[PDB]
Amino acid sequence: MVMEKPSPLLVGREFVRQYYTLLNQAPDMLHRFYGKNSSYVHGGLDSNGKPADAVYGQKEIHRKVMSQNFTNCHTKIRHVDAHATLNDGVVVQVMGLLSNNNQALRRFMQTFVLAPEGSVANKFYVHNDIFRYQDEVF
Amino acid sequence: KPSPLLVGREFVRQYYTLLNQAPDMLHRFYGKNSSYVHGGLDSNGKPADAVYGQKEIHRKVMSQNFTNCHTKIRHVDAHATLNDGVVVQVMGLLSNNNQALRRFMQTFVLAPEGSVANKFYVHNDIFRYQDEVF
Amino acid sequence: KPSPLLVGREFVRQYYTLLNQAPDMLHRFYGKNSSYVHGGLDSNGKPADAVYGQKEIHRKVMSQNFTNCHTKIRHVDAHATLNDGVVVQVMGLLSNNNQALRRFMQTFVLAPEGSVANKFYVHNDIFRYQDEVF
Amino acid sequence: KPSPLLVGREFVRQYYTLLNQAPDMLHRFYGKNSSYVHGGLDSNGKPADAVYGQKEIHRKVMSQNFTNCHTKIRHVDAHATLNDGVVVQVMGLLSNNNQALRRFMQTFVLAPEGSVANKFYVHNDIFRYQDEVF
Amino acid sequence: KPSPLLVGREFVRQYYTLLNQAPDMLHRFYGKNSSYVHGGLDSNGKPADAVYGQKEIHRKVMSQNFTNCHTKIRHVDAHATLNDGVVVQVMGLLSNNNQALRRFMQTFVLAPEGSVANKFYVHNDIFRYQDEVF
Amino acid sequence: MVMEKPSPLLVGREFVRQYYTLLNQAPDMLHRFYGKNSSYVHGGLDSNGKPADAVYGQKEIHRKVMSQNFTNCHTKIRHVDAHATLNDGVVVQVMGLLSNNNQALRRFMQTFVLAPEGSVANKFYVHNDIFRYQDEVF
Amino acid sequence: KPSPLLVGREFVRQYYTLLNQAPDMLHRFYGKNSSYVHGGLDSNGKPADAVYGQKEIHRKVMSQNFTNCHTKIRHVDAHATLNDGVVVQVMGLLSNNNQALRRFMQTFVLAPEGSVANKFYVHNDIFRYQDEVF
Amino acid sequence: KPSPLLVGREFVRQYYTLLNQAPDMLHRFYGKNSSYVHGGLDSNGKPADAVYGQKEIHRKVMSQNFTNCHTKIRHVDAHATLNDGVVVQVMGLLSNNNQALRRFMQTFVLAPEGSVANKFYVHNDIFRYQDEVF
Amino acid sequence: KPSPLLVGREFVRQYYTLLNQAPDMLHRFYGKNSSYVHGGLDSNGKPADAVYGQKEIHRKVMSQNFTNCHTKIRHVDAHATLNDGVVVQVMGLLSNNNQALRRFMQTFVLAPEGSVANKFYVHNDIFRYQDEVF
Amino acid sequence: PITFGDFNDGEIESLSSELLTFGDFLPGEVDDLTDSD
Amino acid sequence: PITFGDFNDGEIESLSSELLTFGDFLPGEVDDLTDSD
Amino acid sequence: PITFGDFNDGEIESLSSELLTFGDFLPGEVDDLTDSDW
Helix, strand or coil: CCCCCCCHHHHHHHHHHHHHHHHHHCHHHHHHHEEEEEEEEECCECCCCCECCCEECCHHHHHHHHHCCCCCCEEEEEEEEEEECHHHCEEEEEEEEEECCCCCCEEEEEEEEEEECCCCCCCEEEEEEEEEECCCCC | CCCHHHHHHHHHHHHHHHHHHCHHHHHHHCCCCCEEEECCCCCCCCCCCCEECHHHHHHHHHHHCCCCCEEEEEEEEEEEEHHHEEEEEEEEEEECCCCCCEEEEEEEEEEECCCCCCEEEEEEEEEEECCCCC | CCCHHHHHHHHHHHHHHHHHHCHHHHHHCEEEEEEECCCCCCCCCCCCCCEECHHHHHHHHHHHCCCCCEEEEEEEEEEEECCCEEEEEEEEEEEHHHCCCEEEEEEEEEEECCCCCCEEEEEEEEEEECCCCC | CCCHHHHHHHHHHHHHHHHHHCHHHHHHHEEEEEEEEECCECCCCCECCCEECHHHHHHHHHHHCCCCCEEEEEEEEEEEECCCEEEEEEEEEEECCCCCCEEEEEEEEEEECCCCCCCEEEEEEEEEEHHHHC | CCCHHHHHHHHHHHHHHHHHHCHHHHHHHCCCCCEEECCCCCCCCCCCCCEEHHHHHHHHHHHHCCCCCEEEEEEEEEEEEHHHEEEEEEEEEEECCCCCCEEEEEEEEEEECCCCCCEEEEEEEEEEECCCCC | CCCCCCCHHHHHHHHHHHHHHHHHHCHHHHHHHEEEEEEEEECCCCCCCCCCCCECCCHHHHHHHHHCCCCCCEEEEEEEEEEECHHHCEEEEEEEEEECCCCCCEEEEEEEEEEECCCCCCEEEEEEEEEEEHHHCC | CCCHHHHHHHHHHHHHHHHHHCHHHHHHHEEEEEEEEECCECCCCCECCCEECHHHHHHHHHHCCCCCCEEEEEEEEEEECHHHCEEEEEEEEEECCCCCCEEEEEEEEEEECCCCCCEEEEEEEEEEEHHHHC | CCCHHHHHHHHHHHHHHHHHHCHHHHHHCEEEEEEECCCCCCCCCCCCCCEEHHHHHHHHHHHHCCCCCEEEEEEEEEEEECCCEEEEEEEEEEEHHHCCCEEEEEEEEEEECCCCCCEEEEEEEEEEECCCCC | CCCHHHHHHHHHHHHHHHHHHCHHHHHHHEEEEEEEEECCECCCCCECCCEECHHHHHHHHHHHCCCCCEEEEEEEEEEECHHHCEEEEEEEEEECCCCCCEEEEEEEEEEECCCCCCCEEEEEEEEEEHHHHC | CCEECCCCCCHHHHHCCCCCEECCCCCCHHHHHHCCC | CCEECCCCCCHHHHHCCCCCEECCCCCCHHHHHHHCC | CCEECCCCCCHHHHHHCCCCEECCCCCCHHHHHHCCCC
């Protein structure tokens, strides 16, 4: 009955579950997860051969997220490992499979950094998101 | 103010050079309140609890016993985080004890020391292989 | 007509492989009005109430958050039960998200279907950990 | 129609009372078509196979020769099953001949007689000591 | 007098099907004075010690506890040896617990049982992965 | 000072060392290792795509060795595992690298079976040899 | 008359050489009235009683199935006794079938026949593995 | 001038990698009139003799039969010594042919070639296991 | 020119005699430029760094405060080195203050004085207790 | 009738029942789902 | 002068000695043998 | 001339003196062809 507060591991696992369920169902609402100074890169590839750079905000990450069509995405998580970091933040490492538009499942590797909003207790926003398919890099 | 990408590249090259060269002094990259989770070390080898502090980090690294761990870094991504911190996630191929080349991900969260400018220490170090999952 | 041991062993293999690979597809193992505990504990520190109906079983299965749920089968015992059912007692170890392996027991009651022969739907699925009670 | 939880609890109490008060009449709990295994090992190390039939069950009980067996039922969970049957999963400690307690996992399957109300017979009995298989 | 190639193919298909299906009954293939050596389990897992007899062979096989071990046979070479024995050397991809496919060599030396014609038992069984050596 | 008899592990290791040292230095003399009923395959590949068949004698072992024309071979044994078998014989499993004429190091897998001649104690001959490159199999 | 120390040392090396290479011919060392015990155990756990007579000694030796016994002799102490006989005290390690070495304690007493010079036979042989009686 | 700590560490890394990969090329580490005691107990029960010259060093190295020799360096200590030499004491674990890891030490005395910069040849190489002595 | 084996053996005996008989004058075995380490641990757990200079060696010995050091020298191996110098490698057990024995590993480097015939001084001293590092 | 150990012809071939299905899964649909994924 | 932990500028660079050779092996020849076969 | 049992003297070393060889090679025959280089 002792309420306590969520551990970093449980927080990270809950965030992974919430993030990928929302992405699979309503990708357009994904932009609500991030913040004003939230850096985001999601398996990009520019017209040069090197991985794409990262966005550093809200409007432009929403624009990127619309740029990727992100329809009927199926995700299969093989590894979520979370730990505590500076300012009660949680650093999360995720590995698994992702498939967009019902294509073949491709191996993805990702790193989240969640930070507290401060004013509201037990509220976290995605300060950092680093996602790469290990097929356009390996 | 150094660039987050620049500091990420510098740290990755320095950390892996030291790891290949002198694994004993690997703990010098960390400090107090530094989380170190790396691979799996148990009777079954699956569960490996993270250790905290320079003493425990050095003990864990020595228990691992990296011997000529050749690393071929394929991708480094470094970004900004809280307290003007730097988070660096790296993709590469790691082969220790002259074994097979294996894929891995290492994610560091680096915190500034605060005393000296352009000084950082490994606050969080999460390592994972590719064969251990999937 | 196959052996009850045959049916139990094959179901154990299929269930504990599909649990690791695609846990979201487990709901297709059960049928209408099937009991599925697997809670272990609840908010009041008590064995969770059974959830009935494929929708409820799927919801609870998704809530459990099985990621790379490894299973270490120590023993599987299958016996014939009423209405050409099969009762399977599976004991072993389970590790979710590559955590520490915990001892577990599971009781399966698989009822057949008068329509399709050699087809079984899990009428009862009871799961418990050893540590949560001892 | 009493609740399956109460049915299973009452049966567990009566069975573990007769395990030591009077093991001679333990076979009266089992029906003609009934499976029984109580955690045996053979020369090769595989757990002993179940026996069938009330008389074979009685003979196996006598071979086990329970002498003042002491029980501590850590957990019991009963649920509904085919033909209003009940499946009971019990976890606890059993000590034979006043010796050290041993952890055990058990599954009972009780099927109604169909002759008189609220009467059950042990269709299935699966008992397993933890240390023997784990 | 069955062909050595024929008996090698029959044994390889039978052994791997049983291994994928019923790991518990794997010991049945062996007998007395039979040497079984595999990947090996220890504090570190490096020292792979041979075990003899059905008792130890079953214990070691259950300790390795193959679960849905999928085997894709790439090559089989069967030849004649002393006492009209058959020596089998097998290449394939073995994926245990739904891990990745890993190359391996399994070398069997089969001896005739003597009493029943066209009956063989695994006298020597040497298993060696690829990644752990190279 | 107790003389004793060599263990199967030591016998197999010594045989592997002798086999590959002789082969690297004087391949033409390798024919002496075998016996009248010595089945032998060595990384064969006929003009069909399937691995070659076996040879079971001295004269054909000789001509076969001259057929593969071993010159200045560089072998690197990575694993040798020996065990006792029927009639005091020893079954040996070998894995490693083999390069002929200074070509690329090829992954090789081999199985020897050594049997006692009988007349002179502690004397063996290679009853069985199964050698295959992983490249021509995998 | 040679030194009893040398006599005992040479007998020790010859005896273990024959115990390893040709255990069938070990009986030739023993004589009509000789005692043998080689660290056996019975059901009750008392060490096996010694046997007598060359033929019964040979039978027991063969039943012991000495297969490629590897022995390291830590200490030999030979001294004079009755009728120019020699008592030999041996401490060492012995392993059959290439298992792990087991520490052993041994006492020989050899007696000259009186027919030809410098000829001895094993009057008594007492052998005990340390881990079985300590 | 490189620090002795650096020269010793580099030599340890190169030596214990080349020992694993290409043992036949170890003979080129040494030079004329160099001592190489690597070995153990001889027939006369004495420390292995020193082999001098690349001819005897290579012959002894090939006699040792270093197959897949795995090394875990517990500690490396380097100290400057006479004639601007380096003395390195390396303690750790060694396993030949993937066998059990045994504790060992090695003492290297490295002398610098007469007319070249940063070039060392091992003048002395003394190796000892722990079990062979204690 | 006495043999290096005898030189090293005599020095070992004298050094371990003065280690307990009179540790006050142990500093006399070293010169102006001598390295000394005797198995120490720091706060971080790395082995203690060696010291240099005769006076610093004397200080370190006094800090170690050897009181009646009982030493059992299991193995000594002395061999030639640069300009008639000798390298000694010693393994054994050492216990100070009449406490429990501890396994130890040591390397001495003795360089001739060049002014007095058959004069040696400890250029280098490396001592490591097994428990602290392994 | 070439069997091995304490086996006769019939046991493991019947112990490998490919026709057995559970739930609504089509025969082998679960297997394929696990393989190559 | 961007360093990490406690290092100053370049002690690790000094500890990385690429010009050091042992025996007659050419600089980096050993690394070549161990990495590329 | 110390002897034990009914064994002839020296026949013990005769039986246990055979060295481990291979093929039809004499003892150590393979080595000298091998040891023709550095």
